[PDB]
Design a protein around this ligand. Structure first.
Ligand SMILES: [Ca+2]
Ligand SMILES: [Ca+2]
Ligand SMILES: [Ca+2]
Length: 404
């Protein structure tokens, strides 16, 4: 059994009294709902309030989310209920605390009194010319415009970032990683960090744009999009590796499919159309995160159909990730916990078998491990496609589940 939970949103840093302190009062409900791992935000000093422009990686006390004591108390509470803590690891780029003789912020500070992570411009990808000194290797992935991109081919960078990651485990208690902006460096570089730190899992945010047609909707065929994700997993080490990816292919398809286009939820081979259909053991599915939803709203799930997204991901193969706001703020707590209970009760896991029974515009119905059937869509009647022996279980707005 494995169910992830994103334990923050884009406004969390503002929480009066501290976000981790507030989360202490949320631990029992998260664990009782069947969550096994909670993804926490970047914990270090950051030039931006939300944590995504880290500077002094060891300076946990500088975070807006709370200090190291408050973070360790929350991780200890999660562990007390048997739930793991996943740290948001932001290493594609990094802000430097000091200026060099050129007046450029390219002399870094790790946050410890010794030289750990106190890099210079030789550690900045040479092609990030706003900051580099032209001497490093070219970036192994995309650039993040607002800050120096780090040259992961540099041996000192690799060694000192692995030391820092191991310290997040040994000192703070983190168990696993979520790799931010993983399209910023190659999967071969991600492999150095994952293999060198043995996290229980490392879920990477590899977010490529989805191919769209002239009407603005994603294409029915997203094979190229999921092919890039499975190739990333192969390059990080495949089944041997602790690495896995967020299923952005399923997110993009599901965003469109629930708008009366549920025929999008099966490919021409009879499989789920996202990474779920090709390598479910490596696909972390989700309805929204702090970038797609929350107050950034870059690619929000249709608001009136969010429970159909959960009926889908919580009953299907792949590893589902529940978003904080949906569980605590939108009123879906009981419904989401009920769906996870159905998943756990029936022994459904990332590699459960999926048999799709109907895939029409207003009705998608699927059977998982021969034990659970789920329907989403506005169609009133799908009775004839429910196999014998199934009894109604949980239901809500445009979704229903049956158990056998
Ligand atoms: Ca230092
Ligand atoms: Ca950059
Ligand atoms: Ca980069």
């Amino acid at each position: 059994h494995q169910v992830l939970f994103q334990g923050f949103n884009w406004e969390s840093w503002k929480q009066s009294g501290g976000w981790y302190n507030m989360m202490m009062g949320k631990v029992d409900d998260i664990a009782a709902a069947g969550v096994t791992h909670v993804w926490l935000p970047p914990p270090s000093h950051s030039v931006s309030n939300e944590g995504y422009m880290p500077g002094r990686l060891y300076d946990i006390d500088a975070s807006k989310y709370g200090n190291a004591a408050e973070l360790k108390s929350l991780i200890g509470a999660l562990h007390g209920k048997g739930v793991q803590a996943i740290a948001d690891i932001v290493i594609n780029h990094r802000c430097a605390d000091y200026k060099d003789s050129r007046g450029i912020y390219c002399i870094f500070e790790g946050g410890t009194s010794d030289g750990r992570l106190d890099w210079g411009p030789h550690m900045i990808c040479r092609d990030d010319t706003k900051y580099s000194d032209g001497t490093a290797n070219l970036d192994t992935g995309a650039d993040f415009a607002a800050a120096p991109d780090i040259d992961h081919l540099n041996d000192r960078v690799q060694r000192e970032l692995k030391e820092w990651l191991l310290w997040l485990k040994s000192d703070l208690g983190f168990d696993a990683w979520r790799l931010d902006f993983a399209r910023g460096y190659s999967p071969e570089m991600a492999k150095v960090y994952i293999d060198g730190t043995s996290p229980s899992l490392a879920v990477a945010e590899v977010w490529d744009n989805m191919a769209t047609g002239g009407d603005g909707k994603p294409n029915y065929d997203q094979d190229a999009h999921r092919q890039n994700l499975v190739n990333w997993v192969d390059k990080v080490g495949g089944a041997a590796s602790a690495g896995m990816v967020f299923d952005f292919t399923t997110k993009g398809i599901l965003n469109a499919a629930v708008e009366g286009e549920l025929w999008r939820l099966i490919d021409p081979q009879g499989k789920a159309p996202g990474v779920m259909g090709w390598w479910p053991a490596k696909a972390v599915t989700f309805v929204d995160n702090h970038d797609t939803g929350s107050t950034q709203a870059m690619w929000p799930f249709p608001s009136d159909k969010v429970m159909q997204g959960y009926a889908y991901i919580l009953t299907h193969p792949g590893i589902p990730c529940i978003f904080y706001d949906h569980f605590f703020n939108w009123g879906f707590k009981d419904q989401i916990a009920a769906l996870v209970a159905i998943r756990k009760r029936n022994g459904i896991t990332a590699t459960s078998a999926l048999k799709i029974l109907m895939h029409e515009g207003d009705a998608y119905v699927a059977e998982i491990d021969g034990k659970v059937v789920v329907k989403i869509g506005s169609r009133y009647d799908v009775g004839a496609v429910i196999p014998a022996g199934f009894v109604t279980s949980a239901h809500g707005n445009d979704y229903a589940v049956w158990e056998k």
